[PDB]
């Protein structure tokens, strides 16, 4: 029975509004309703992995697991295995997988982050799950961010706290936050970004939604505009939105948006918004294709509609050779030529690099680079041909060309990372000097760039 080189992943996010679900929620897992929906001919085909994020979830873990498993069994006739479940307050993540994957999944991690301080600590934050699927690392974050149309900067701060403090994946990747630890990272939830139009325009917005004319609303969506100004979710992807705003509905219908201020809302307006979102980030040149992104029309217990997204995701096999794992394959090498980091820092410390990769026995520290002043007032750190030759554990090109090298540039004075990035080994050629590039980030914000050339030697 062969190992897969692709799997499909379902991501669901639903803010349940503290109400139990209706008796049937199969439309959610079938990707049926509005937006980019799944073909009817696929209805019996199970996804490999289902990841369900809830917010304002009033159920126990047992109660929700029973509903989810009974829903999937009715759709697929498969009894899914529980990989992980983790709950912070009323924010929950469930990961289910086909039973045939039980011995492909390992290194399961869960964590949460509580956002805010005093007044604003106690209900918002995030839960996460990570695991290995054969040779591929997968991370999943369900966040419930700060509410309210005039709190976009608080949401952005919540995002940065969650990616800094959520402790998932390989703890040996110490310089790297969750935005670099995984082959594929999915980040979803009630992100709570709103359509930023005047209150007076509420009925005009509703009109537009009834006409399925979303363009002048999406041009005011705070998550799209904050992402375009590089204020949040830098280097993440989102599918085009082609479904109506998923908040705020009158319960028990979808015919009415309830936007007006009420004592129950703190006298705040809730103009129709795309609160409920799925975003992803995958390593460079790894296959990831969104095959659905939409909302359900028939689940009406909450003031939010459920959102679905599904993905094709490339995966790799747990590679064994005669040599690695547990020795190097001296037929393999990675050389970095003429590399330099450009940093936005005002600091004048020396810097060194660390190279991290599951193709190495352990991470590799470089010598310090040579600092020069860039013309437009920046730091350029030159490494020359000084960088250590990296010795992968396996030289087979079928393995090595699928790997990635994480890079951290660290201060000699503090050993703190000033920037992190990732280089694919999926090269156009081996034994050939080729350009490489990554942006560098720290705490998820842009701090610089790393560029140079690579020369990869494989056994072929």
Ligand X SMILES: N#Cc1ccc(N2CCCOCC2)cn1
Distance, in Å, from the CA atom of 269 to the CA atom of 263, rounded to the nearest integer, reads 11
With contacts defined by CB under 6 A, name the span among 164-172, 323-331, 332-340, 418-426 that binds ligand X: 164-172
Residue 375 DSSP label: T
Q: Is residue 341 within the footprint of ligand X (CB under 6 A)?
A: no
E strand map for 167-223: 184-190
Q: Is residue 110 within the footprint of ligand X (CB under 6 A)?
A: no
Among positions 55, 130, 438, 441, the unique one binding ligand X when judged by CB under 6 A: 130
Residue 171 or 228: the one with the smaller Cβ distance to ligand X is 171
CB-CB neighbours of 340 under 10 Å: 17
Q: How far is the CB of 321 from ligand X (least distance, A)?
A: 20
CB 352 within 8 A of CB 408: no
Distinct helix (H) and strand (E) counts, the chain: 8, 21
Q: How far is the CB of 414 from ligand X (least distance, A)?
A: 23
Residue 91 or 138: the one with the smaller Cβ distance to ligand X is 138
Give Dmax over CA atoms of the chain in angstroms.
71
Task: Please provide the DSSP assignment of 84-110 as one string.
Answer: EEEEETTEEEEEEE-GGGTTTEEEEEE
Q: Looking only at residues 167 through 186 of this chain, which bind ligand X when binding is defined by CB under 6 A? A: 169-172
Per-residue interface string for the shown chain with ligand X, residues 63-102, x marking contact by CB under 6 A = ----------------------------------------
With contacts defined by CB under 6 A, name the span among 129-137, 145-153, 253-261, 401-409 that binds ligand X: 129-137
Q: Looking only at residues 136 through 155 of this chain, which bind ligand X when binding is defined by CB under 6 A? A: 137
Among positions 11, 83, 113, 132, the unique one binding ligand X when judged by CB under 6 A: 132
CB 388 within 8 A of CB 366: yes
CB-CB neighbours of 45 under 10 Å: 11
Q: How far is the CB of 316 from ligand X (least distance, A)?
A: 13
- Cα torsion through 232, 452, 435, 394, rounded to 10: -90
Residue 33 or 169: the one with the smaller Cβ distance to ligand X is 169
Q: Is residue 361 within the footprint of ligand X (CB under 6 A)?
A: no
Token pair recorded at residue 344: 């936005």
Q: How far is the CB of 109 from ligand X (least distance, A)?
A: 5
| In the complex, residue closest to ligand X by CB | 137
Per-residue interface string for the shown chain with ligand X, residues 377-396, x marking contact by CB under 6 A = --------------------
- Cα torsion through 312, 316, 318, 320, rounded to 10: 160
Q: Looking only at residues 300 through 329 of this chain, which bind ligand X when binding is defined by CB under 6 A? A: none
Sorted by sequence, the CB contacts under 8 Å of residue 290 that are 6+ apart come out as: 36, 237, 239, 280, 309, 310, 311
Q: Is residue 113 within the footprint of ligand X (CB under 6 A)?
A: no
Q: How far is the CB of 107 from ligand X (least distance, A)?
A: 4
Residue 172 or 210: the one with the smaller Cβ distance to ligand X is 172
Q: How far is the CB of 380 from ligand X (least distance, A)?
A: 34
Q: How far is the CB of 251 from ligand X (least distance, A)?
A: 39
Q: How far is the CB of 176 from ligand X (least distance, A)?
A: 11
Residue 459 CA: distances (Å) to CA of 112, 246, 329, 400, 456: 43, 52, 9, 10, 10
Residue 144's H or E segment, with its range, is: strand 136-144
Residue 216 CA: distances (Å) to CA of 15, 201, 205: 25, 12, 9
Q: How far is the CB of 137 from ligand X (least distance, A)?
A: 3
Number of residues that bind ligand X (CB under 6 A): 9
Residue 170 or 298: the one with the smaller Cβ distance to ligand X is 170
| Residues at the site binding ligand X, with contacts judged by CB under 6 A | 107, 109, 130, 132, 137, 169-172
């Amino acid at each position: 029975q062969p190992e897969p080189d692709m799997i499909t992943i379902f991501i669901g996010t639903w803010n349940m509004g503290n109400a139990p679900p209706p008796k049937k929620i199969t439309s959610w897992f079938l990707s049926k309703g509005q937006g980019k929906t799944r073909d009817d001919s696929a209805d019996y085909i199970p996804h490999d992995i289902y990841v369900i994020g809830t917010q304002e979830d009033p159920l126990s873990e047992k109660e929700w697991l029973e509903i989810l498993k009974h829903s999937l069994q009715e759709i697929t006739s498969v009894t899914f295995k529980t990989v992980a479940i983790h709950t912070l307050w009323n924010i929950r993540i469930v990961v289910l997988a086909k039973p045939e994957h039980e011995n492909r999944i390992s290194h399961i991690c869960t964590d949460n982050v509580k956002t805010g301080i005093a007044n604003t600590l106690g209900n918002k934050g995030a839960v996460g799950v990570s695991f290995m699927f054969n040779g591929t690392s997968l991370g999943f974050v369900n966040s419930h961010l700060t509410s309210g149309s005039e709190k976009k900067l608080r949401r952005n701060q919540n995002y940065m706290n969650i990616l800094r403090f959520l402790a998932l994946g390989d703890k040996k990747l110490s310089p790297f936050n969750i935005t670099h630890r995984f082959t594929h990272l999915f980040w979803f939830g009630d992100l709570n970004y709103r359509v930023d139009l005047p209150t007076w325009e509420a009925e005009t917005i509703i009109q537009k939604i009834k006409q399925q004319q979303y363009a002048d609303l999406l041009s005011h969506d705070q998550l799209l505009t904050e992402r375009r100004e590089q204020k949040v979710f830098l280097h993440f992807e989102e599918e085009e939105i082609t479904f109506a705003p998923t908040y705020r509905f009158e319960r028990l219908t979808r015919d009415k948006y309830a936007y007006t201020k009420q004592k129950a809302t703190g006298m705040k307006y809730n103009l129709p918004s795309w609160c409920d979102r799925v975003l992803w980030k995958s390593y460079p040149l790894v296959h990831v294709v969104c095959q659905s992104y939409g909302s359900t029309s028939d689940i009406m217990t909450s003031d939010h509609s459920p959102v679905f997204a599904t993905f094709e995701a490339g995966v790799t096999s747990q590679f064994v050779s005669k040599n690695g794992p547990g020795t190097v394959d001296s037929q393999g090498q990675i050389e970095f030529l003429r590399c330099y980091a450009t940093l936005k820092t005002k600091s004048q410390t020396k810097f060194y690099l660390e190279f991290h990769s599951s193709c190495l026995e352990s991470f590799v520290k470089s010598q310090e680079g040579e600092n020069e002043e860039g013309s437009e007032g920046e730091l350029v750190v030159k490494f020359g041909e000084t960088l250590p030759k990296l010795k992968p554990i396996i030289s087979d090109p079928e393995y090595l060309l699928d790997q990635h090298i994480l890079i951290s540039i660290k201060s000699s004075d503090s050993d703190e990372s000033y920037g992190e990035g990732c280089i694919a080994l999926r090269l156009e050629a081996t034994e050939t000097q080729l350009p490489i590039y990554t942006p560098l980030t720290h705490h998820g914000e842009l701090t610089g760039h790393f560029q140079g050339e690579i020369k990869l030697q494989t056994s072929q």
